Design a protein around this ligand. Structure first.
Ligand SMILES: [As]
Length: 151
């Protein structure tokens, strides 16, 4: 309603780089987008940029769970962006996510950790995009896709 796009990302990894470019392009195409600084319920789309350290943050994972729980009941459409991490690593929490989850496991409720894993697993099964040989092309596709998709 109030926002066409809600941007979920690990600031430390992408705020000043990929996200600054994606946000600029979205605003340019007149796409109303939200991104916190250093409304998920009121956003139509959720572009989630899962970077190397996204899963290292329990806060980012909490946001992903919030988003996926809303997506499950059709309250939001999620667009996955695998940035620097393979989709299968996200799906099984392997690759760099393994060590990040070992950390979480030693300091969080086991059931909460499983809840995080569930969101990631479900997230990795949605149709999305992976970072490749050109971020500028990836940004154009995302903007174009949303642009041809908004009411
Ligand atoms: As992909």
């Amino acid at each position: 309603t109030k926002y066409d796009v809600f941007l979920s990302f690990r600031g430390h990894d992408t705020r000043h780089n990929f996200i600054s470019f994606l946000y600029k392009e979205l605003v340019r195409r007149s796409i109303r987008t939200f991104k916190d600084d250093k409304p998920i319920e009121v956003s139509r789309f959720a572009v989630v940029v899962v970077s190397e350290n996204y899963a290292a943050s329990s806060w980012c994972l909490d946001e992903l769970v919030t988003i996926m729980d809303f997506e499950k009941k059709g309250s939001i459409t999620v667009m996955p962006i695998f940035y620097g991490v393979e989709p299968n690593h996200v799906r099984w929490q392997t690759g760099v996510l393994a060590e990040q989850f070992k950390k979480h496991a030693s300091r969080e409720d086991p059931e909460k950790v499983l809840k995080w894993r569930q969101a990631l697993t479900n997230f990795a099964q949605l149709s999305g995009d992976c970072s490749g040989d050109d971020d500028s092309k990836l940004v154009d596709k995302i903007a174009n896709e949303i642009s041809n998709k908004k009411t």
